[PDB]
Amino acid sequence: MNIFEMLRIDEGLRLKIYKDCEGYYTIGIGHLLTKSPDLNAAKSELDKAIGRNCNGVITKDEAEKLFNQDVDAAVRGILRNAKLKPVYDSLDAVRRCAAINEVFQMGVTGVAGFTNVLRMLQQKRWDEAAVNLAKSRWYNQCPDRAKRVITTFRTGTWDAYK
């Protein structure tokens, strides 16, 4: 088990443009196209991401190329953020996977606003953090995409994906 297998379970594959739990336009392995309510914008966003007229539908190899890029972006997003990096770097290996997962799904900005959870995580207060994440807007709207991640932050094992 690793971050790619983890996200493949959580986001699955979709080779046609769907609206995600947050209500935004998405494709592949959880690749967000835009937060605009306009489908045709997301349709052009796909074409721009791949380098061709898709046009709303991509292949499996292209999805995996986007997936590598997005996981890279999530890691870089964490390391570049002053709030997230010190918390991240305090985490053990498995919880760091949960952290990459949450940023991949929610984006850096959303996550960095969870100020008290970040504090609880840095001080290894796993139970409270789990509870506080459980009452998030992320969790309440995306409970199936979020559930295993919260549990991972609590236990620091891979058991929720087993």
* Closest CB to Cl ion among residues 126, 139: 139
Closest CA to 66 of 11, 23, 133, 115: 11
Residue 144 designated active-site: no
Nearer to Cl ion, 125 or 147 (CB): 147
Residue pair 34/41 in contact by the 8 Å Cβ criterion: yes
Least separation, in Å, of the C-beta of 120 and Cl ion? 23
Residues lying near Cl ion in the complex (CB under 5 A) are found at 4, 21, 142, 144-145
Exactly one of 5, 10, 11, 61 is catalytic; which is it?
A: 11
Nearest-approach distance from CB 49 to Cl ion, in angstroms: 21
Could you tell me the CA-to-CA distances from 5 to 17, 99, 111, 146 in Å, in that order? 22, 15, 22, 15
- The CA distance from 153 to 73, in Å, is 21
How many Å apart are CA 69 and CA 22, to the nearest integer?
21
| 11 carries an active-site annotation | yes
> Between residues 145 and 154, which has the closer beta carbon with respect to Cl ion?
145
Known catalytic residues are: 11, 20
